[PDB]
Amino acid sequence: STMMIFTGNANPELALKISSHLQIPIGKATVGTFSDGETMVEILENVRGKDVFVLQSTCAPANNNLMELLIMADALRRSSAGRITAVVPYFGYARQDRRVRSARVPITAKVVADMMASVGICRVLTVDLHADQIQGFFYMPVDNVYSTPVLLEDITKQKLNNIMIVSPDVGGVVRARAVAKRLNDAELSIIDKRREVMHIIGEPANKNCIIVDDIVDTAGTLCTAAHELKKNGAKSVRAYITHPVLSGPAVNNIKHSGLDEVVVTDTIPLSAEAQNCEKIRVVSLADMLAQAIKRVNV
Amino acid sequence: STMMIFTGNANPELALKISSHLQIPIGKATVGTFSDGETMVEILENVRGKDVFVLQSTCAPANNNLMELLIMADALRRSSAGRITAVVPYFGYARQDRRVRSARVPITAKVVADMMASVGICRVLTVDLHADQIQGFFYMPVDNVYSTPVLLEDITKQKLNNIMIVSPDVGGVVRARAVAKRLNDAELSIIDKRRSEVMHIIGEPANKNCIIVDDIVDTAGTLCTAAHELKKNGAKSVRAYITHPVLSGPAVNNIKHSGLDEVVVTDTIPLSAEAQNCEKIRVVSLADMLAQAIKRVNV
Ligand SMILES: Nc1ncnc2c1ncn2[C@@H]1O[C@H](COP(=O)(O)OP(=O)(O)O)[C@@H](O)[C@H]1O
Ligand SMILES: Nc1ncnc2c1ncn2[C@@H]1O[C@H](COP(=O)(O)OP(=O)(O)O)[C@@H](O)[C@H]1O
Ligand SMILES: Nc1ncnc2c1ncn2[C@@H]1O[C@H](COP(=O)(O)O)[C@@H](O)[C@H]1O
Ligand SMILES: Nc1ncnc2c1ncn2[C@@H]1O[C@H](COP(=O)(O)O)[C@@H](O)[C@H]1O
Ligand SMILES: O=P(O)(O)OC[C@H]1O[C@H](O)[C@H](O)[C@@H]1O
Ligand SMILES: O=P(O)(O)OC[C@H]1O[C@H](O)[C@H](O)[C@@H]1O
């Protein structure tokens, strides 16, 4: 009623699905570039006093997708939108969230958080934030929704027994345990790479192994984890990973790996090449995100 | 002694020329991308207490070049640089500097100014800012240096008579007059288009060697339509001096097929290979001017 939704160019397919679940159309807006490539925005709706949600992951191309979101917010703010919420299902730059050992590097996730505050965004809604502590980078509320229910429901459809959940690094154990907890408290193993050489903490022999992670980027560790699980007698290996970044050699890595299937969500659209990769399959968070948007709408 | 310079990927050739004039090396820093395209920066020098200058036009790719500048500044700031100056010879997004008739548009130039303040930049140095009033978008000092001395020196080398300076639109008259006044107080004409778009000239260019002056050549529509109108109205020759060679889309081919004798541009923005192959386009360098401006603010 007060709710309006706009989208940039980052993931128009997900925006269309969210709109279908909300039963409200996508608001009209020019979001593109000038001839020279500068980001170009004009809002083509009256937004005064409206509860406005901008649907825009900051996936590749990250800086262009971020600038679209930021200057959409700037345009909406000076046009007197009542509230501006950034729905950023995949939050780019989240891995740059500290200076490891005080290295002379930026904290780009904090730069981005401050950018969003600077243009008058009032809330962030995001999925499986790489570090939930990124909530504290913001004064504004940050709703970090977990993809676990949708990934769990798809795992259930596979009708597997002897399930073992595998964390592919020591940083992903919390997310991996959250899946294992809901599968009759399934077994959990952790991949521990040293020096060069990977070690499995746990016993994968004759197990249907399911690697769980938040991001698949180059898929290098995902595929080396799958090879080592199979070399140690896994009955099968699949992966459930929220955000399909899939940069560089990722699709070829997956194609030539021992993974049965890699299931990802639609926080990031797949390239044409990834859409043609028979091992990759998408499950949707559009319903979950629509429900989250309805919960905050006022 | 206290000065350090770094550069991103926007215009390394200009950065290296400035470095050569200052006789100080470019500081070591990784400026690139992670595999997924996210901007990646690591400063590879001790910068503590140093007077640091980051050389980075925000020309195309504008958002990537801007992000490099911003997170270079963020890295330098957390590394305790003494001062951080953004040397941005071409300031991208300067044309989005108001909401025309309160349209529902961003003021992106102000978004960008606030971005620079937010990462701890202490000063901006820029060339021929599209609107000098953008200085007031900032709390920090903004030094807007004019390219005029370099363009005047080059015009003088041509040894032309019957010179007429031409503003190719009504917003360029202040810049064009500043050149005309300093060029032996030359005559001035103005191109005035009306969507009837029909061209009209204010002034008399017949039999004159006309020199179009402007800040940006982007698609070259303004430039080429002005050059055609001047030739149609009897100009003896037409050339152009335009600071920033954005040169998007069909710009180079438009210039190639125009009647322009020459288009002189600066090196605030690197030329594409196609522009480099266009005999009509010639570059004059602002490396010395920018080096001197950097020396002037160095503490
Ligand atoms: N887009 C990116 N792609 C790959 N690595 C990144 C990216 N952004 C930051 N990083 C790097 O990832 C590292 C931190 O990642 P994170 O998952 O938070 O912890 P860990 O290093 O334990 O995996 C840092 O070295 C950081 O520079
Ligand atoms: N990168 C760009 N390329 C082309 N036009 C732009 C760009 N950025 C902003 N603009 C548009 O140019 C117009 C303002 O330009 P300016 O030269 O200041 O005044 P004028 O409208 O008289 O040309 C605005 O409509 C703005 O939307
Ligand atoms: N003593 C420590 N306590 C907690 N985290 C650490 C420690 N040492 C390194 N790390 C983190 O571990 C990662 C790198 O591991 P390493 O190979 O041990 O340097 C980086 O994310 C560091 O921030
Ligand atoms: N899917 C998930 N991703 C990341 N963290 C989670 C997830 N599920 C639970 N947690 C965290 O795990 C901890 C234990 O909470 P719980 O397991 O829900 O009792 C809390 O800090 C949660 O935030
Ligand atoms: O091996 P890649 O797919 O390139 O990187 C993916 C990892 O990058 C981040 O740490 C995520 O948490 C994943 O574990
Ligand atoms: O005609 P284009 O080359 O695309 O645009 C360049 C013009 O755009 C701006 O007004 C500048 O001041 C120039 O006059």
Closest-CA residue to B251 (of B229, B240, B231, B193): B240
- The domain in which residue A168 lies consists of 147-283
Which two structure tokens, joined as six digits, stand for B136?
Answer: 């007031």
Q: How far apart are the C-alpha atoms of B158 and B188, rounded to whole Å?
A: 18
A77 and A191 co-located in one domain: no
Experimental method: X-ray
Give, for A285, the enclosing helix (H) or strand (E). none
Q: How far apart are the C-alpha atoms of A225 and A254, rounded to whole Å?
A: 12
Contact list, B118 vs chain A (CB under 8 Å): 111, 114-115, 118
Residue A176 CA to ligand 3 center (angstroms) comes to 20
Which residue type sits at A258? G
Q: How many CB pairs under 8 A join A and B?
A: 124
Q: How far apart are the C-alpha atoms of A151 and A127, rounded to whole Å?
A: 13
**B30 touches B44 (CB < 8 A):** yes
A140 and A151 co-located in one domain: no
What are phi and psi for residue B57, nearest 5 degrees? -65, 150
Contact list, B36 vs chain A (CB under 8 Å): 60, 62, 217, 245, 247-248
How does B83-110 read in b/e, with b if 16+ C-beta sit within 10 Å?
A: bbbbbbbbbbbbbbbeeeeeebbbbbbb
- Which of A71, A79, A105 lies at the smallest CB-CB distance from B108? A71
B125 and B163 co-located in one domain: no
Residues sharing a CB contact under 8 Å with residue B202, sequence separation 6 or more, in sequence order: B189, B190, B191, B192
Q: How far apart are the C-alpha atoms of A35 and A10, rounded to whole Å?
A: 19
Residues sharing a CB contact under 8 Å with residue B203, sequence separation 6 or more, in sequence order: B164, B166, B187, B188, B189, B190
Which two structure tokens, joined as six digits, stand for B106?
Answer: 């961003």
Strands B187-191, B163-167: pairing is: parallel
Total count of domains within chain A: 2
Residues sharing a CB contact under 8 Å with residue B247, sequence separation 6 or more, in sequence order: B217, B218, B220, B269, B271, B272, B275
A5 and A122 co-located in one domain: yes
Cβ distance B71 to A111 less than 8 Å, yes or no, reads yes
Q: How far apart are the C-alpha atoms of A74 and B119, rounded to whole Å?
A: 19
A130 and A14 co-located in one domain: yes
What are phi and psi for residue A287, nearest 5 degrees? -65, -45
Cβ distance A108 to B36 less than 8 Å, yes or no, reads no
Within 13 A of B171's CA, how many CA atoms are on the CB side?
8
A188 and A296 co-located in one domain: no
Strands B201-202, A208-216: pairing is: unpaired
Residues sharing a CB contact under 8 Å with residue A130, sequence separation 6 or more, in sequence order: A91, A94, A95, A97, A214, A215
Closest-CA residue to A156 (of A184, A189, A128): A184
Protein residues with CB under 6 Å of any ligand 2 atom: A 34-36, 38; B 95-96, 100, 171
User: Per-residue DSSP letters for B99-165?
Assistant: -GGG-S---HHHHHHHHHHHTT--EEEEES-SSGGGGGG-SS-EEEE-SHHHHHHHHHHT--SSEEE
Protein residues with CB under 6 Å of any ligand 6 atom: B 169, 172, 214-223
B142 and B153 co-located in one domain: no
A70 and A202 co-located in one domain: no
Quote the strand ranges of chain B, DSSP E: 3-7, 29-33, 39-43, 51-55, 83-87, 123-127, 142-145, 163-167, 187-191, 201-202, 209-217, 237-245, 263-266, 281-284
Chain A closest-CA separation from residue B39 CA (Å): 8
A32 and A171 co-located in one domain: no
Residue linked to tokens 């050339």: B239
**A202 touches A187 (CB < 8 A):** yes
- SS3 assignment, position B172: helix
B101 and B119 co-located in one domain: yes
The three-state DSSP-derived secondary structure of A120-164 is: CCCEEEEECCCCHHHHHHCCCCEEEECCHHHHHHHHHHCCCCCEE
Domain at B243, CATH number: 3.40.50.2020
